[PDB]
Design a protein around this nucleic acid. Structure first.
Lengths: 100, 108, 117, 189
RNA sequence: GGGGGAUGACCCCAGGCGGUAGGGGAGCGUUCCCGAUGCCGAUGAAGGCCGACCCGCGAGGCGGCUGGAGGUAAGGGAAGU
RNA sequence: AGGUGGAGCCUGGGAGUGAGGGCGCGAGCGAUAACGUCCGCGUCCGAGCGCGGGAACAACCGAGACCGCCAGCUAAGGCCC
RNA sequence: ACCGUGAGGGAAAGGUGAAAAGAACCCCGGGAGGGGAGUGAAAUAGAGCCUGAAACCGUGGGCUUACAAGCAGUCACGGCCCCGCAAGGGGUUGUGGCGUGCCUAUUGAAGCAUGAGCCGGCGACUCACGGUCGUGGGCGAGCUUAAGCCGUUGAGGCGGAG
């Protein structure tokens, strides 16, 4: 149940535990949706093969939710008379690891 | 369980402090000889605030002896802002740091 | 036209204060260096903000070595051989593997060594 | 247009190009404005005190630094300067103009002269039940030359005159009536 | 800036974006005057005390405890901010 | 001519500093002496031209800091600890 | 009140409650002050007794502390402790990893240059008449003094030297 493909960014090493995933506001909207995610890390049941052997099949996961920035603050300061403050961003829509 | 106290108490909060920090959490009767035969002032005082303590209870807070001091403390406040020799020009006052005196008396 | 700013400033401070965990003996409530100490901590975090992701670039670096060598070779070998790759190229996760799934790792480890020599 | 005539079942009067027209908020308020204005009051903080006492701001080379401001209750810094020119004389034209278009806004309500006669603030409870609602809520008295007697008193007073009864007047949100002689102010218009 | 914007907004790519005096634009709370066919509250005005929803933000909202009586303005105005 | 692409010109409101140094080079002085000063050509710093390097070191080599912690190639500079 | 021989200077300090019903009596105690009862909607509303924040002194508890450096700290990983926004976070840190405070004036500043011990409240680009550009808008000949009259609200409207 544990695979490791890689999206518009590695963000990988999963199977089912839906992994907070980088944005993608074009296919997402698709609530609990289905979509393909190229592989390149075939690790299943103690059997592996090139991430280049893979680059042929893959998987897919249901477009779950739209995590809302998990808090995180950025005190932008310095002795040099320069301050300011902006809170987290990076969310992301969640989605389970549809393995195959 | 019950308790004794008293503010507007002229004295070295500090000093005081050692006071209990001894007889502290311990058998009534027991320390009741600590402060009876210890030393430094406060004692006297300290003692006092143990009798209306042991009292209050049994009397209106009730089982004698089996008692003691689950806890005891003192706080400062009110000061006594005191004037002294004008820097031989400007004033220099100290402060007999008034003194509070609470202290528990609960039964074994 | 009274301005008893009052209630207001006080607040602000509270503000920061919060910004005020329970750090070092003092500042703790240090309605100043209180505030200060801040600015500091901040920017810090920042630079830390981008930092980390580095501290990693390396972390894996070793845990990596831990293996890359294990078998018998370094990360200027592997690497070279690796990029000899063609339909498979990654590094991060690689490590956290070699340790997670020995076989898996072990694997490539080969296909690799080879690619190379 | 829909110049409705009171007495209701009786006649209807025409809408005078004047009122008709469009609108001009900007001026709108403005009219307003040049209202409260010339109509507020004034104030300040002591001239004597705030620059009242002697002062020995102290030598120096001692441990200090220095009858002025910045140590307590005293000074000010630029306060209520009663000498605070409060007026604001809008401008004729300006004004008038307002009321106008203003009123225009009013149109969006016809007081038969014949009323310039009724003689009791309980004859209002009447010509009342005639046509009430919420706009009446507003209301807004006004006869034509010499006010609508008793009509002037109640729980909505205010008796302009075919002359004297501008925006300050009702202009505000509001809703009211004018005795012909009233539209004698229109002439003023 | 430019390709059509329905009021939003959406798409491309060009295109940067470190900045003190200092120049231009935009927003935030503070005590007051409207009550532009505005009024909440003894089952709390407000300040206080504490917080893992809303905002780039300066603030918001909202829920728990406190405390004895107020005042809020959906919008424009004013200033001892 | 112009590949460029985004600087240019006039009218007009609001300005700030009106004394700087550091480095390379070409000259002046100077014991071709000084982290000396004095003029020039480019850069440099400006209390943030913040990060890398050279241990540490504005500053000299590379670099233009909108934001994204568990991506990828390199610069200069390095790879026995 | 107070320093000044004098002329003169010149403060601080308001708030219980609906009303005292303001705490008879009993308790330890020389008392003050503390324990009960009683008023009471509440007395942690209780006699300088509304709200009564911070700084600062206490009393217990969690965690933590004796081959260890820096205000800071913030990034990583770990154990203990609680999960009224539970498979995610709280708090505390053992290590290691990268780190020179903060303000004015400065060519240049960590600073060993100065500014400040700590907290709370005061405290600094304003108003008027002119002039000056820009803009929101009313007529292009545009526009009003002072005053006369009208004025719960008090309603502006006439005034034509300039």
């Amino acid at each position: 149940m544990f695979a490791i493909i890689q999206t518009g960014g590695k963000q990988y090493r999963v199977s089912e535990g839906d992994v907070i995933r980088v944005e993608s506001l074009q296919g997402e909207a698709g609530d609990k949706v289905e979509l393909k995610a190229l592989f390149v890390g075939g690790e299943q049941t103690v059997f592996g093969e090139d991430a280049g052997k893979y680059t042929v099949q893959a998987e897919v996961v249901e477009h779950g939710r739209g995590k809302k920035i998990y808090i995180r603050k950025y005190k932008s300061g310095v002795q040099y008379r320069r301050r300011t403050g902006h809170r987290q961003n990076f969310t992301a829509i969640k989605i389970l690891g549809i393995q195959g | 369980e019950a308790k004794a106290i008293a503010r507007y108490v002229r004295i070295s909060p500090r000093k005081v402090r050692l006071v209990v920090d001894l007889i502290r959490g311990k058998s009534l009767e027991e320390a009741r000889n600590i402060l009876r035969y210890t030393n430094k002032r406060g004692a006297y005082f300290v003692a006092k605030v143990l009798e209306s303590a042991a009292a209050n209870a049994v009397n209106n807070h009730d089982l004698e002896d089996r008692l003691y001091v689950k806890a005891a403390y003192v706080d400062e406040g009110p000061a006594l802002k005191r004037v002294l020799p004008r820097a031989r020009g400007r004033a220099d006052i100290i402060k007999k740091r008034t003194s509070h005196i609470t202290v528990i008396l609960g039964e074994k | 036209p009274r301005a008893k700013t009052g209630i207001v400033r006080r607040r602000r401070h509270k503000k920061v204060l919060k910004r005020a965990k329970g750090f070092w003996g003092s500042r703790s409530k240090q309605y100043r260096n209180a505030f200060q100490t801040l600015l500091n901590a901040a920017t810090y975090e920042y630079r830390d903000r981008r930092n980390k992701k580095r501290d990693f670039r390396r972390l894996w670096i070793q845990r990596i070595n831990a293996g890359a060598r294990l078998h018998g070779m370094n990360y200027s070998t592997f690497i070279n051989g690796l990029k000899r790759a063609n339909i498979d190229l990654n590094r991060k996760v690689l490590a956290d593997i070699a340790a997670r799934e020995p076989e898996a790792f072990k694997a490539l480890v080969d296909a690799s060594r080879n690619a190379r020599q | 247009m829909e110049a409705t005539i009171y007495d209701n079942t009786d006649g209807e009067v025409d809408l005078p190009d004047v009122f008709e027209t469009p609108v001009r908020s900007d001026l709108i308020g403005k009219a307003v404005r040049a209202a409260q204005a010339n109509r507020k009051q004034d104030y300040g903080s002591d001239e004597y005190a705030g620059l009242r006492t002697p002062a020995e701001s102290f030598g120096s080379g001692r441990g200090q630094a220095h009858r002025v401001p910045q140590a307590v209750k005293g000074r000010s810094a630029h306060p209520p300067k009663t000498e605070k020119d409060r007026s604001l004389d809008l401008n004729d034209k300006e004004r008038q103009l307002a009321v106008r278009s203003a009123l225009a806004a009013t149109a969006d309500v016809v007081v038969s002269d014949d009323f310039e006669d009724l003689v009791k603030t309980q004859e209002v409870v009447s010509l009342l039940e005639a046509l009430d609602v919420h706009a009446d809520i507003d209301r807004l008295f006004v006869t034509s030359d010499e006010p609508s007697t008793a009509a002037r008193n109640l729980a909505g007073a205010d008796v302009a005159t075919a002359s004297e009864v501008n925006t300050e007047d009702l202009a505000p949100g509001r809703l009211t009536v004018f005795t012909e002689s009233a539209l004698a102010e229109v002439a003023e218009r």
